[PDB]
Amino acid sequence: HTIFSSLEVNGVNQGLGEGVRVPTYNGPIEDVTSASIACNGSPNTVASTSKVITVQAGTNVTAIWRYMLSTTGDSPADVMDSSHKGPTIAYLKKVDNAATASGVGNGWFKIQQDGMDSSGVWGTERVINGKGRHSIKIPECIAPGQYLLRAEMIALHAASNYPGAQFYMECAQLNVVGGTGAKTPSTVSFPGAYSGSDPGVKISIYWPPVTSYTVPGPSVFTC
Ligand SMILES: *[C@@H]1O[C@H](CO)[C@@H](O[C@@H]2O[C@H](CO)[C@@H](O)[C@H](O)[C@H]2NC(C)=O)[C@H](O)[C@H]1NC(C)=O
Ligand SMILES: [Cu+2]
Numbered sequence: 001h002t003i004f005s006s007l008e009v010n011g012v013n014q015g016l017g018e019g020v021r022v023p024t025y026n027g028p029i030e031d032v033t034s035a036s037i038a039c040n041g042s043p044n045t046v047a048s049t050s051k052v053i054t055v056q057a058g059t060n061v062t063a064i065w066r067y068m069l070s071t072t073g074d075s076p077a078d079v080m081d082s083s084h085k086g087p088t089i090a091y092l093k094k095v096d097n098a099a100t101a102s103g104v105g106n107g108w109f110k111i112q113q114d115g116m117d118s119s120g121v122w123g124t125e126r127v128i129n130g131k132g133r134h135s136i137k138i139p140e141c142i143a144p145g146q147y148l149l150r151a152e153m154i155a156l157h158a159a160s161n162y163p164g165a166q167f168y169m170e171c172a173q174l175n176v177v178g179g180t181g182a183k184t185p186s187t188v189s190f191p192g193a194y195s196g197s198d199p200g201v202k203i204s205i206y207w208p209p210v211t212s213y214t215v216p217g218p219s220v221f222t223c
Pocket of ligand 1: 111
C-alpha cells in the first residue's frame with residue numbers, strides 16, 4: 001500500500017496532489033483488464049487537479065511515494081511495506097489536454113523500468129529505502145506538448161496466482177517543453193498491455209527463488 005502523491009521538478013516539490021491525480025486510499029488495483037489500471041480508479045476514488053506541470057525534455061522528474069496521503073516522514077515504513085517486492089515503471093501518453101484526458105486507451109509508451117538486478121534487489125526496494133524517490137528521465141527526443149505521466153510500483157509478494165499481483169499507480173499532468181520531436185514512439189493501451197498470464201505478473205518470487213525477472217509491458221523507449 002502506497003501512493004505517488006507529489007512530483008519533484010527542477011529540485012522543487014510541486015505540492016501534495018498538485019498536478020498528480022491522487023486517490024484517497026492507498027490500496028492496489030488487481031484486475032489488469034479494468035479501466036482503473038491506467039490512472040487508478042474504481043473502487044478507489046481519484047481526485048482531479050487543475051495544475052499542469054511544466055518540465056524540460058531530457059531532465060529527470062522524481063515521483064515521491066508515500067504510504068498514505070497524510071504521511072509526513074520518509075523512512076521505509078512511510079513509503080511502503082518491505083514485503084512489497086517488485087518493479088518500478090513509468091510511462092508517458094501524449095494528450096491534447098492533460099487536466100482533462102482520462103488516460104484510458106492507447107498512446108502509452110514506457111520510459112523507465114527497474115526490475116530485479118543481478119544481486120537480487122528489486123526496484124521497489126530502492127524506492128522504499130531511498131526516501132520514496134522514483135527518478136524518471138523525460139526523453140529529449142519526443143514532441144513537445146501535454147502528456148500524462150503514469151508512475152507505477154507492482155508488488156509481487158502475493159502474485160503466485162492471478163489475481164495476486166498488486167498494481168499501484170498514479171498519473172501526473174505535464175507540459176513538456178523543449179522536445180525535439182525527432183522520434184515517434186510505438187504505443188500500447190491501458191488496459192491491454194498487461195495480461196494475467198504474463199511472466200512478470202503471475203510469478204512465485206520465493207519458491208523457487210527467481211534469478212531473473214521480466215518486467216511486463218513494452219520495451220523502454222530510448223532516443
Ligand atoms: C534519471 O532517471 C533515469 C531513469 O529514467 C536514471 O537512470 C538510471 O540510473 C541508475 C543509477 O542510479 C542506473 O543503474 C540505471 O541504469 C539508469 N537507467 C537508465 C535507463 O539509464 C538516472 O539515474 C536519473 N538521473 C538523475 C540525475 O537522477
Ligand atoms: Cu500493500
